[PDB]
Ligand binder design. Sequence first.
Ligand SMILES: O=c1ccn([C@@H]2O[C@H](COP(=O)(O)OP(=O)(O)O[C@H]3O[C@H](CO)[C@@H](O)[C@H](O)[C@H]3F)[C@@H](O)[C@H]2O)c(=O)[nH]1
Ligand SMILES: O=c1c(O)c(-c2ccc(O)cc2)oc2cc(O)cc(O)c12
Length: 439
Amino acid sequence: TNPHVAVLAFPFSTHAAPLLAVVRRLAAAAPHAVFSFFSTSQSNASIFHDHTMQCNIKSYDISDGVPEGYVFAGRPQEDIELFTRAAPESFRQGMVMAVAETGRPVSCLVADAFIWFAADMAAEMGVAWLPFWTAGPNSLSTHVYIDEIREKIGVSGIQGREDELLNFIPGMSKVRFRDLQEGIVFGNLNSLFSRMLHRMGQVLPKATAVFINSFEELDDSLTNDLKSKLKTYLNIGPFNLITGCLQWLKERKPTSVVYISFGTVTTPPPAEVVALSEALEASRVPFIWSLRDKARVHLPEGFLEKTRGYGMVVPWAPQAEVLAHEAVGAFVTHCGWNSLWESVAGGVPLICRPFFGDQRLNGRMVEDVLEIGVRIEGGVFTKSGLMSCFDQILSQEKGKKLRENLRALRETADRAVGPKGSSTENFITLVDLVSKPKD
Ligand SMILES: O=c1ccn([C@@H]2O[C@H](COP(=O)(O)OP(=O)(O)O[C@H]3O[C@H](CO)[C@@H](O)[C@H](O)[C@H]3F)[C@@H](O)[C@H]2O)c(=O)[nH]1
Ligand SMILES: O=c1c(O)c(-c2ccc(O)cc2)oc2cc(O)cc(O)c12
Protein backbone atom coordinates (compact mmCIF):
# COMPACT_ATOMS: atom_id res chain seq x y z
CA THR A 1 0.00 0.00 0.00
CA ASN A 2 0.93 3.69 -0.07
CA PRO A 3 2.44 5.02 3.19
CA HIS A 4 0.79 4.95 6.61
CA VAL A 5 2.85 6.97 9.07
CA ALA A 6 2.21 6.24 12.78
CA VAL A 7 3.01 9.20 15.04
CA LEU A 8 3.70 8.57 18.74
CA ALA A 9 3.41 11.73 20.90
CA PHE A 10 4.72 12.34 24.45
CA PRO A 11 1.53 13.73 26.04
CA PHE A 12 3.16 15.95 28.70
CA SER A 13 4.30 19.65 28.57
CA THR A 14 5.09 21.08 25.12
CA HIS A 15 5.89 17.95 23.13
CA ALA A 16 2.70 16.88 21.30
CA ALA A 17 1.99 20.32 19.80
CA PRO A 18 5.35 20.83 17.96
CA LEU A 19 5.13 17.22 16.75
CA LEU A 20 1.62 17.85 15.35
CA ALA A 21 3.01 21.00 13.70
CA VAL A 22 5.63 18.93 11.77
CA VAL A 23 3.06 16.27 10.95
CA ARG A 24 0.87 19.01 9.41
CA ARG A 25 3.79 20.09 7.15
CA LEU A 26 4.52 16.45 6.28
CA ALA A 27 0.84 15.70 5.41
CA ALA A 28 0.80 18.66 3.00
CA ALA A 29 4.11 17.59 1.45
CA ALA A 30 3.09 13.92 1.16
CA PRO A 31 -0.64 14.08 0.33
CA HIS A 32 -0.67 10.43 -0.79
CA ALA A 33 0.39 9.28 2.71
CA VAL A 34 -2.02 8.79 5.63
CA PHE A 35 -0.99 9.87 9.14
CA SER A 36 -2.29 8.47 12.43
CA PHE A 37 -1.53 10.65 15.47
CA PHE A 38 -1.42 8.88 18.87
CA SER A 39 -1.65 10.67 22.22
CA THR A 40 -3.90 10.63 25.33
CA SER A 41 -7.45 11.97 25.05
CA GLN A 42 -6.51 15.08 27.13
CA SER A 43 -3.48 15.83 24.95
CA ASN A 44 -5.35 15.42 21.66
CA ALA A 45 -8.30 17.50 22.92
CA SER A 46 -5.87 20.31 23.74
CA ILE A 47 -3.74 20.27 20.57
CA PHE A 48 -6.55 19.53 18.07
CA HIS A 49 -8.75 22.34 19.48
CA ASP A 50 -10.69 23.41 16.33
CA HIS A 51 -11.85 22.93 9.53
CA THR A 52 -8.13 23.57 8.78
CA MET A 53 -6.70 20.11 9.56
CA GLN A 54 -5.23 18.19 6.61
CA CYS A 55 -7.69 15.47 5.61
CA ASN A 56 -4.96 12.79 5.61
CA ILE A 57 -4.42 13.15 9.40
CA LYS A 58 -6.58 11.43 12.05
CA SER A 59 -5.91 11.43 15.80
CA TYR A 60 -6.32 8.38 18.05
CA ASP A 61 -6.73 8.48 21.84
CA ILE A 62 -4.48 6.05 23.69
CA SER A 63 -4.40 5.06 27.39
CA ASP A 64 -2.89 7.42 29.98
CA GLY A 65 -1.79 4.27 31.86
CA VAL A 66 -3.77 5.11 34.99
CA PRO A 67 -5.53 1.99 36.37
CA GLU A 68 -9.29 2.46 36.98
CA GLY A 69 -9.29 2.71 40.82
CA TYR A 70 -5.82 4.27 41.18
CA VAL A 71 -4.99 6.58 44.08
CA PHE A 72 -2.06 8.88 43.39
CA ALA A 73 0.84 8.82 45.84
CA GLY A 74 1.59 12.42 44.81
CA ARG A 75 5.14 11.83 43.60
CA PRO A 76 6.66 14.12 41.02
CA GLN A 77 6.64 12.49 37.55
CA GLU A 78 3.96 9.97 38.76
CA ASP A 79 1.74 10.68 35.70
CA ILE A 80 4.78 10.30 33.44
CA GLU A 81 5.70 6.99 35.12
CA LEU A 82 2.18 5.58 34.73
CA PHE A 83 1.94 6.63 31.08
CA THR A 84 5.46 5.35 30.28
CA ARG A 85 5.01 1.91 31.86
CA ALA A 86 1.81 1.29 29.84
CA ALA A 87 2.93 3.09 26.65
CA PRO A 88 4.37 0.13 24.66
CA GLU A 89 1.00 -1.61 24.92
CA SER A 90 -1.06 1.62 24.63
CA PHE A 91 0.61 2.66 21.35
CA ARG A 92 0.47 -0.92 19.97
CA GLN A 93 -3.32 -1.03 20.56
CA GLY A 94 -3.75 2.43 18.96
CA MET A 95 -1.79 1.33 15.87
CA VAL A 96 -3.91 -1.85 15.64
CA MET A 97 -7.03 0.38 15.47
CA ALA A 98 -5.49 2.72 12.85
CA VAL A 99 -4.30 -0.17 10.61
CA ALA A 100 -7.85 -1.66 10.68
CA GLU A 101 -9.51 1.70 9.94
CA THR A 102 -7.19 2.60 7.05
CA GLY A 103 -6.55 -0.92 5.73
CA ARG A 104 -2.86 0.03 5.42
CA PRO A 105 -0.05 -1.49 7.47
CA VAL A 106 2.18 1.06 9.27
CA SER A 107 5.05 1.92 6.91
CA CYS A 108 6.97 4.38 9.10
CA LEU A 109 7.24 5.18 12.78
CA VAL A 110 7.65 8.85 13.80
CA ALA A 111 7.85 9.37 17.57
CA ASP A 112 8.98 11.86 20.23
CA ALA A 113 12.61 10.89 21.13
CA PHE A 114 11.36 10.35 24.67
CA ILE A 115 9.49 7.19 23.51
CA TRP A 116 12.86 5.35 23.32
CA PHE A 117 11.19 1.89 22.87
CA ALA A 118 9.79 3.17 19.59
CA ALA A 119 13.17 1.96 18.20
CA ASP A 120 12.29 -1.61 19.22
CA MET A 121 8.66 -1.35 17.96
CA ALA A 122 9.94 -0.12 14.57
CA ALA A 123 12.47 -3.00 14.33
CA GLU A 124 9.68 -5.47 15.18
CA MET A 125 7.42 -3.98 12.49
CA GLY A 126 10.23 -3.73 9.92
CA VAL A 127 9.78 0.03 9.40
CA ALA A 128 11.98 3.17 9.61
CA TRP A 129 12.20 4.85 13.03
CA LEU A 130 12.19 8.68 12.85
CA PRO A 131 12.52 10.27 16.30
CA PHE A 132 11.75 13.96 16.91
CA TRP A 133 13.97 15.71 19.46
CA THR A 134 11.66 18.49 20.64
CA ALA A 135 14.35 20.57 22.38
CA GLY A 136 17.79 21.97 21.44
CA PRO A 137 20.92 20.36 19.93
CA ASN A 138 22.81 21.11 23.16
CA SER A 139 20.66 18.75 25.21
CA LEU A 140 20.55 16.22 22.33
CA SER A 141 24.37 16.12 22.36
CA THR A 142 24.69 15.58 26.13
CA HIS A 143 22.09 12.77 25.97
CA VAL A 144 23.90 11.06 23.07
CA TYR A 145 27.16 11.42 25.11
CA ILE A 146 25.75 10.20 28.46
CA ASP A 147 28.12 7.18 28.83
CA GLU A 148 31.24 9.20 27.98
CA ILE A 149 30.24 12.10 30.27
CA ARG A 150 29.56 9.63 33.13
CA GLU A 151 32.95 7.96 32.47
CA LYS A 152 34.83 11.28 32.42
CA ILE A 153 33.10 12.92 35.41
CA GLY A 154 31.92 9.96 37.51
CA VAL A 155 28.50 9.37 39.08
CA SER A 156 29.23 10.02 42.77
CA GLY A 157 28.54 13.77 42.65
CA ILE A 158 30.10 16.96 41.28
CA GLN A 159 30.64 18.72 44.64
CA GLY A 160 33.50 21.21 44.30
CA ARG A 161 33.45 20.81 40.50
CA GLU A 162 30.17 22.62 39.57
CA ASP A 163 31.93 25.28 37.49
CA GLU A 164 34.35 22.96 35.66
CA LEU A 165 33.89 22.98 31.89
CA LEU A 166 32.49 20.26 29.65
CA ASN A 167 35.09 21.33 27.07
CA PHE A 168 35.95 17.73 26.19
CA ILE A 169 32.64 17.50 24.26
CA PRO A 170 32.46 19.23 20.84
CA GLY A 171 30.30 22.37 20.83
CA MET A 172 30.13 22.42 24.62
CA SER A 173 33.17 24.54 25.49
CA LYS A 174 31.07 27.02 27.53
CA VAL A 175 28.92 24.48 29.39
CA ARG A 176 29.71 23.87 33.03
CA PHE A 177 29.10 20.62 34.93
CA ARG A 178 26.22 22.29 36.83
CA ASP A 179 24.46 23.12 33.49
CA LEU A 180 23.83 19.44 32.75
CA GLN A 181 20.30 17.98 32.85
CA GLU A 182 19.28 15.91 35.85
CA GLY A 183 19.90 12.21 35.27
CA ILE A 184 23.30 12.64 33.59
CA VAL A 185 25.75 12.88 36.54
CA PHE A 186 23.47 14.29 39.27
CA GLY A 187 19.85 13.95 40.43
CA ASN A 188 18.17 10.57 40.95
CA LEU A 189 20.10 8.43 38.49
CA ASN A 190 17.93 5.40 39.23
CA SER A 191 14.55 7.00 38.52
CA LEU A 192 12.40 5.65 35.71
CA PHE A 193 12.74 9.01 33.84
CA SER A 194 16.55 8.95 34.23
CA ARG A 195 16.78 5.36 32.94
CA MET A 196 14.41 6.20 30.02
CA LEU A 197 16.66 9.07 28.87
CA HIS A 198 19.79 7.00 29.37
CA ARG A 199 18.50 4.30 27.00
CA MET A 200 17.21 6.89 24.57
CA GLY A 201 20.73 8.35 24.39
CA GLN A 202 22.08 4.90 23.53
CA VAL A 203 19.57 3.98 20.85
CA LEU A 204 19.34 7.35 19.02
CA PRO A 205 22.46 6.55 16.90
CA LYS A 206 20.40 3.60 15.50
CA ALA A 207 17.55 5.76 14.13
CA THR A 208 16.91 6.03 10.37
CA ALA A 209 17.11 9.81 11.03
CA VAL A 210 16.83 12.10 14.02
CA PHE A 211 15.05 15.40 13.31
CA ILE A 212 15.00 18.61 15.35
CA ASN A 213 13.28 22.04 15.49
CA SER A 214 16.54 24.01 15.00
CA PHE A 215 18.83 25.22 12.18
CA GLU A 216 22.30 23.80 11.33
CA GLU A 217 24.00 27.23 11.37
CA LEU A 218 23.12 27.80 15.05
CA ASP A 219 26.44 26.03 15.67
CA ASP A 220 28.33 24.42 12.74
CA SER A 221 30.66 22.36 14.97
CA LEU A 222 27.78 20.95 17.04
CA THR A 223 25.92 20.13 13.81
CA ASN A 224 29.00 18.42 12.37
CA ASP A 225 29.56 16.46 15.58
CA LEU A 226 25.96 15.25 15.72
CA LYS A 227 26.07 14.18 12.03
CA SER A 228 29.12 12.06 13.00
CA LYS A 229 27.24 10.40 15.93
CA LEU A 230 23.89 9.83 14.20
CA LYS A 231 23.01 8.01 10.98
CA THR A 232 21.12 11.04 9.57
CA TYR A 233 20.53 14.29 11.43
CA LEU A 234 18.00 16.76 10.10
CA ASN A 235 17.59 20.33 11.40
CA ILE A 236 14.13 21.47 10.08
CA GLY A 237 13.38 24.63 12.08
CA PRO A 238 12.73 27.00 13.65
CA PHE A 239 9.08 25.99 13.12
CA ASN A 240 7.74 29.36 14.35
CA LEU A 241 9.55 31.20 11.50
CA ILE A 242 7.97 28.84 8.94
CA THR A 243 4.39 28.83 10.25
CA GLY A 244 -7.47 40.91 26.26
CA CYS A 245 -3.65 41.03 26.14
CA LEU A 246 -3.19 42.29 22.57
CA GLN A 247 -5.81 45.04 22.99
CA TRP A 248 -4.04 46.09 26.23
CA LEU A 249 -0.58 46.10 24.56
CA LYS A 250 -1.91 48.41 21.81
CA GLU A 251 -1.76 51.38 24.25
CA ARG A 252 1.75 50.73 25.67
CA LYS A 253 4.95 52.48 24.54
CA PRO A 254 7.39 50.53 22.31
CA THR A 255 9.83 48.21 24.09
CA SER A 256 8.38 49.09 27.52
CA VAL A 257 6.61 45.91 28.77
CA VAL A 258 8.05 42.91 30.64
CA TYR A 259 6.43 39.56 29.80
CA ILE A 260 6.79 36.76 32.40
CA SER A 261 6.16 33.01 31.96
CA PHE A 262 7.63 29.75 33.23
CA GLY A 263 6.30 27.31 30.67
CA THR A 264 3.72 24.59 31.21
CA VAL A 265 4.92 22.58 34.22
CA THR A 266 6.68 25.13 36.48
CA THR A 267 5.82 27.83 39.01
CA PRO A 268 8.68 29.49 40.91
CA PRO A 269 8.73 28.88 44.66
CA PRO A 270 6.44 31.24 46.67
CA ALA A 271 9.38 33.41 47.85
CA GLU A 272 10.43 33.97 44.25
CA VAL A 273 6.83 34.81 43.36
CA VAL A 274 6.95 37.45 46.14
CA ALA A 275 10.35 38.64 44.85
CA LEU A 276 9.09 39.18 41.30
CA SER A 277 5.97 40.97 42.55
CA GLU A 278 8.17 43.31 44.62
CA ALA A 279 10.44 44.09 41.64
CA LEU A 280 7.44 44.81 39.37
CA GLU A 281 5.76 47.08 41.89
CA ALA A 282 8.97 48.93 42.96
CA SER A 283 9.93 49.67 39.33
CA ARG A 284 6.31 50.32 38.21
CA VAL A 285 7.32 48.60 34.98
CA PRO A 286 4.36 47.66 32.69
CA PHE A 287 3.99 43.86 32.71
CA ILE A 288 2.03 40.81 31.58
CA TRP A 289 2.55 37.88 33.95
CA SER A 290 1.37 34.42 32.89
CA LEU A 291 0.79 32.77 36.24
CA ARG A 292 -1.22 29.63 37.14
CA ASP A 293 -4.49 30.66 38.80
CA LYS A 294 -3.77 28.25 41.67
CA ALA A 295 -0.46 30.10 42.29
CA ARG A 296 -2.17 33.49 42.69
CA VAL A 297 -2.58 32.53 46.38
CA HIS A 298 1.16 33.27 46.72
CA LEU A 299 0.95 36.92 45.55
CA PRO A 300 1.45 39.47 48.41
CA GLU A 301 -1.76 41.02 49.68
CA GLY A 302 -2.45 44.29 47.79
CA PHE A 303 -0.17 43.45 44.80
CA LEU A 304 -2.99 43.05 42.30
CA GLU A 305 -4.66 46.23 43.52
CA LYS A 306 -1.49 48.38 43.41
CA THR A 307 -0.47 47.14 39.91
CA ARG A 308 -3.92 47.19 38.27
CA GLY A 309 -2.99 50.39 36.43
CA TYR A 310 0.02 48.99 34.59
CA GLY A 311 0.15 45.18 34.71
CA MET A 312 -1.96 42.07 34.04
CA VAL A 313 -1.73 38.71 35.81
CA VAL A 314 -3.40 36.01 33.61
CA PRO A 315 -3.59 32.21 33.74
CA TRP A 316 -2.75 31.99 29.98
CA ALA A 317 -1.43 34.51 27.47
CA PRO A 318 -1.24 34.39 23.70
CA GLN A 319 2.54 34.18 24.19
CA ALA A 320 3.93 34.08 20.64
CA GLU A 321 1.74 37.05 19.72
CA VAL A 322 2.69 38.94 22.93
CA LEU A 323 6.44 38.43 22.21
CA ALA A 324 5.95 39.63 18.61
CA HIS A 325 4.25 42.82 19.85
CA GLU A 326 6.28 46.06 19.55
CA ALA A 327 5.37 47.10 23.15
CA VAL A 328 7.25 44.14 24.72
CA GLY A 329 10.85 44.84 25.75
CA ALA A 330 11.90 41.85 27.89
CA PHE A 331 10.94 38.24 28.63
CA VAL A 332 11.41 36.68 32.10
CA THR A 333 11.59 32.97 31.19
CA HIS A 334 12.49 29.43 32.40
CA CYS A 335 14.44 29.09 29.08
CA GLY A 336 12.27 26.35 27.56
CA TRP A 337 13.20 25.67 23.93
CA ASN A 338 9.89 26.75 22.33
CA SER A 339 9.65 29.98 24.37
CA LEU A 340 13.24 30.91 23.41
CA TRP A 341 12.53 30.75 19.68
CA GLU A 342 9.30 32.75 20.07
CA SER A 343 11.36 35.47 21.85
CA VAL A 344 13.92 35.40 19.03
CA ALA A 345 11.03 35.76 16.54
CA GLY A 346 9.87 38.84 18.45
CA GLY A 347 13.38 40.27 18.94
CA VAL A 348 12.89 40.33 22.75
CA PRO A 349 15.87 39.90 25.14
CA LEU A 350 15.61 37.13 27.74
CA ILE A 351 15.92 37.24 31.54
CA CYS A 352 16.74 33.60 32.34
CA ARG A 353 15.67 31.66 35.43
CA PRO A 354 16.13 27.96 34.43
CA PHE A 355 14.71 25.16 36.65
CA PHE A 356 15.25 21.67 35.24
CA GLY A 357 16.00 19.47 32.25
CA ASP A 358 17.64 21.37 29.37
CA GLN A 359 16.83 24.82 30.70
CA ARG A 360 20.32 25.43 32.20
CA LEU A 361 22.00 24.50 28.88
CA ASN A 362 19.58 26.85 27.11
CA GLY A 363 20.32 29.64 29.67
CA ARG A 364 24.07 29.14 29.04
CA MET A 365 23.50 29.37 25.27
CA VAL A 366 21.38 32.52 25.65
CA GLU A 367 23.75 34.37 28.06
CA ASP A 368 27.28 33.28 27.07
CA VAL A 369 27.06 31.97 23.49
CA LEU A 370 24.42 33.95 21.58
CA GLU A 371 24.36 36.89 24.00
CA ILE A 372 20.62 37.47 23.54
CA GLY A 373 19.79 37.58 27.24
CA VAL A 374 21.06 37.97 30.79
CA ARG A 375 21.43 35.90 33.93
CA ILE A 376 19.76 36.59 37.21
CA GLU A 377 22.37 36.97 40.00
CA GLY A 378 22.46 33.63 41.89
CA GLY A 379 19.96 31.88 39.61
CA VAL A 380 17.01 32.85 41.84
CA PHE A 381 14.60 35.80 41.75
CA THR A 382 15.32 38.67 44.12
CA LYS A 383 13.79 42.14 44.08
CA SER A 384 17.11 43.94 43.46
CA GLY A 385 18.47 41.46 40.87
CA LEU A 386 15.26 41.66 38.82
CA MET A 387 15.13 45.45 38.99
CA SER A 388 18.71 45.55 37.68
CA CYS A 389 17.86 43.18 34.78
CA PHE A 390 14.79 45.30 33.80
CA ASP A 391 16.97 48.47 33.79
CA GLN A 392 19.84 46.83 31.81
CA ILE A 393 17.43 45.68 29.09
CA LEU A 394 14.77 48.42 28.91
CA SER A 395 16.83 51.55 29.58
CA GLN A 396 20.58 50.89 29.15
CA GLU A 397 23.12 50.16 26.42
CA LYS A 398 23.15 46.43 27.25
CA GLY A 399 19.56 46.11 25.92
CA LYS A 400 20.47 47.79 22.63
CA LYS A 401 23.28 45.25 22.12
CA LEU A 402 21.02 42.28 22.97
CA ARG A 403 18.41 43.60 20.47
CA GLU A 404 21.14 43.84 17.81
CA ASN A 405 22.29 40.26 18.47
CA LEU A 406 18.67 39.08 18.25
CA ARG A 407 18.19 40.76 14.85
CA ALA A 408 21.27 39.03 13.43
CA LEU A 409 20.33 35.66 14.90
CA ARG A 410 16.80 35.89 13.48
CA GLU A 411 18.11 36.80 9.99
CA THR A 412 20.34 33.66 9.99
CA ALA A 413 17.42 31.52 11.17
CA ASP A 414 15.15 33.08 8.50
CA ARG A 415 17.63 32.14 5.75
CA ALA A 416 17.85 28.54 7.01
CA VAL A 417 14.07 28.24 6.40
CA GLY A 418 13.85 30.20 3.15
CA PRO A 419 14.27 28.92 -0.39
CA LYS A 420 17.54 26.99 -0.64
CA GLY A 421 17.94 27.18 3.20
CA SER A 422 19.55 24.29 5.10
CA SER A 423 16.27 23.49 7.00
CA THR A 424 14.26 23.63 3.77
CA GLU A 425 16.62 21.04 2.14
CA ASN A 426 16.60 18.87 5.32
CA PHE A 427 12.77 18.89 5.36
CA ILE A 428 12.67 17.59 1.77
CA THR A 429 14.92 14.77 2.96
CA LEU A 430 12.52 14.00 5.85
CA VAL A 431 9.51 14.10 3.48
CA ASP A 432 11.35 11.56 1.29
CA LEU A 433 11.90 9.32 4.33
CA VAL A 434 8.23 9.42 5.51
CA SER A 435 7.03 8.92 1.89
CA LYS A 436 8.76 5.55 1.42
CA PRO A 437 6.30 2.68 1.59
CA LYS A 438 7.08 -0.31 3.82
CA ASP A 439 9.83 -2.76 2.75
O1 LIG B 1 0.79 31.62 29.04
C1 LIG B 1 1.33 30.87 28.19
C2 LIG B 1 2.41 30.05 28.53
C3 LIG B 1 2.98 29.24 27.54
N1 LIG B 1 2.48 29.26 26.29
C4 LIG B 1 3.10 28.41 25.25
O2 LIG B 1 3.57 27.14 25.76
C5 LIG B 1 4.84 26.79 25.20
C6 LIG B 1 5.90 26.62 26.28
O3 LIG B 1 6.97 25.89 25.68
P1 LIG B 1 8.45 25.77 26.30
O4 LIG B 1 9.24 24.76 25.50
O5 LIG B 1 9.07 27.12 26.46
O6 LIG B 1 8.19 25.34 27.85
P2 LIG B 1 7.72 23.95 28.53
O7 LIG B 1 6.43 23.44 27.96
O8 LIG B 1 7.89 24.00 30.04
O9 LIG B 1 8.92 23.05 27.94
C7 LIG B 1 9.26 21.73 28.26
O10 LIG B 1 9.64 21.14 27.01
C8 LIG B 1 10.61 21.93 26.29
C9 LIG B 1 10.75 21.37 24.88
O11 LIG B 1 10.69 19.95 24.97
C10 LIG B 1 11.92 22.00 27.09
O12 LIG B 1 12.89 22.82 26.42
C11 LIG B 1 11.62 22.56 28.49
O13 LIG B 1 12.75 22.45 29.35
C12 LIG B 1 10.48 21.79 29.17
F1 LIG B 1 10.13 22.39 30.36
C13 LIG B 1 5.21 27.90 24.23
O14 LIG B 1 4.78 27.56 22.91
C14 LIG B 1 4.39 29.07 24.75
O15 LIG B 1 4.11 30.01 23.72
C15 LIG B 1 1.45 30.08 25.99
O16 LIG B 1 0.98 30.13 24.83
N2 LIG B 1 0.86 30.86 26.93
O1 LIG C 1 8.53 17.60 29.53
C1 LIG C 1 9.59 17.45 30.16
C2 LIG C 1 10.82 17.53 29.51
O2 LIG C 1 10.85 17.77 28.16
C3 LIG C 1 11.98 17.37 30.30
C4 LIG C 1 13.33 17.37 29.67
C5 LIG C 1 14.28 16.47 30.18
C6 LIG C 1 15.56 16.40 29.61
C7 LIG C 1 15.86 17.23 28.52
O3 LIG C 1 17.08 17.16 27.94
C8 LIG C 1 14.91 18.10 27.99
C9 LIG C 1 13.64 18.17 28.56
O4 LIG C 1 11.90 17.12 31.55
C10 LIG C 1 10.81 17.05 32.19
C11 LIG C 1 10.81 16.81 33.56
C12 LIG C 1 9.61 16.72 34.26
O5 LIG C 1 9.65 16.49 35.60
C13 LIG C 1 8.38 16.90 33.60
C14 LIG C 1 8.37 17.13 32.22
O6 LIG C 1 7.19 17.29 31.52
C15 LIG C 1 9.58 17.21 31.53
